[PDB]
Design a binder for this molecule. Structure first.
Ligand SMILES: CCN(Cc1ccc(CNC(=O)c2csc3nc[nH]c(=O)c23)cc1)C1CCCCC1
Ligand SMILES: CCN(Cc1ccc(CNC(=O)c2csc3nc[nH]c(=O)c23)cc1)C1CCCCC1
Lengths: 208, 208
């Protein structure tokens, strides 16, 4: 897999060189290139943003700049990913489907986002996805791209979770549930399913 | 605000020194300390994990190690945050509520997670939250802690979003909607509300 991340904060993608994503890169399973968007600006101040049409707070990322960068990096085979709070929710099923892609391109936005026409134009020659990682506001798309890349890479390198325990058997007056010490696989699997189900009912009823 | 992050991958929290979170730290609004969990291990291999009780794939993070670190870092005023796929969903409302906290402690887990008793014990003297950032599997909690910290810090430093546009008026045969060039605030606000509503119905009907 080839991954290209376009941003004005290249340093923010450095966690990808570490741990599991770093091993996937080093071993040759993933080619990861991080690009500073300012390398496609032709002005003296290297401007990437400009004032919104119709007014409003904040700035908008210029389409010509984004368009130039995407022209050089993408192909018709590219899956262009635009992290945004306006997108569809990223899920494990999305991570799973993205492991079948040959070339992922993450267009990380800053300010109030990227000019909508960058996406309309890109969609003329490639598949484009506007994706959110969850119902919260981030200052930019880089940390969301780390999350999305890590989820994909962990699958490449290969109900709510119940409680887990390890040694000691007793710690600060807290005992590991006796069932885990029973030596009975079937009783353990049934107990793990029940506790996983109770946690799901309590914390995520939408998952049941 | 004081933020303490406990992890075996301290380098993975480096994006927090950059951009908006870095400015919140530098200006004195946030004290951020990142701690290597291995500094609380007393063995020759600096082990933090051990085999699960009742078997299963993967390893579990030792409670004594975690307990020692939390004993030194936390107080009764601490809000202890444990990032986990078994937790409640992190949302903007959660980010907003956390801006009222004096001391946040993020216990970042690796392997199959942290011994459940670390949380039961911590809850004897402090408020504890088990929090997930979304319905996907990450290799660890560090990238989720960056996401959660960035959301909180962006609020400290201070329906789905519709499309945004900037100069030029026409780009690659794509025109900025005429309404944005009308000079009529009320027509613009009504159009932005309608497009925001149509996007929400299409991409996130659960939000309506
Ligand atoms: C006026 C539109 N918004 C601007 C905005 C656009 C883009 C961002 C940057 N976010 C991401 O790039 C992002 C990328 S993926 C993602 N997932 C969840 N949440 C996210 O914010 C993101 C931040 C603020 C507002 C900012 C907060 C107040 C109301 C919404
Ligand atoms: C056997 C239990 N799971 C183990 C697991 C526990 C903890 C993690 C690490 N994740 C986080 O620390 C985490 C912290 S916050 C968060 N939010 C969304 N998703 C996340 O994974 C996380 C990864 C795998 C399985 C691993 C994938 C196959 C089924 C579930």
């Amino acid at each position: 897999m080839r991954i290209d991340i376009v941003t004005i904060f290249p340093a923010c993608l450095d966690p990808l060189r570490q741990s599991l994503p770093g091993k996937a890169i080093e071993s040759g399973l993933v080619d990861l290139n991080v690009h500073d968007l300012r390398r496609w600006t032709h002005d003296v101040h290297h401007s990437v943003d400009d004032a919104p049409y119709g007014g409003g707070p904040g700035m908008v990322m210029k389409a010509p700049v984004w368009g130039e960068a995407l022209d050089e990096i993408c192909s018709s085979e590219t899956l262009l990913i635009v992290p945004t709070p306006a997108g569809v929710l990223f899920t494990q099923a999305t991570a799973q489907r993205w492991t079948t892609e040959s070339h992922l391109v993450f267009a990380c936005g800053r300010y109030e986002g990227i000019d909508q026409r960058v996406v309309q134009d890109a969609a003329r020659r490639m598949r484009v996805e506007e994706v959110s990682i969850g119902d919260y506001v981030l200052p930019g798309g880089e940390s969301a791209a780390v999350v999305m890349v890590e989820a994909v890479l962990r699958l490449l390198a290969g109900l709510l979770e119940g409680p887990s325990y390890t040694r000691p058997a007793s710690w600060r007056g807290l005992d590991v549930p006796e069932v885990l010490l029973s030596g009975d696989h079937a009783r353990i699997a049934a107990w793990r399913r029940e506790v996983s189900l109770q946690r799901t009912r309590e914390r995520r009823p939408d998952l049941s």
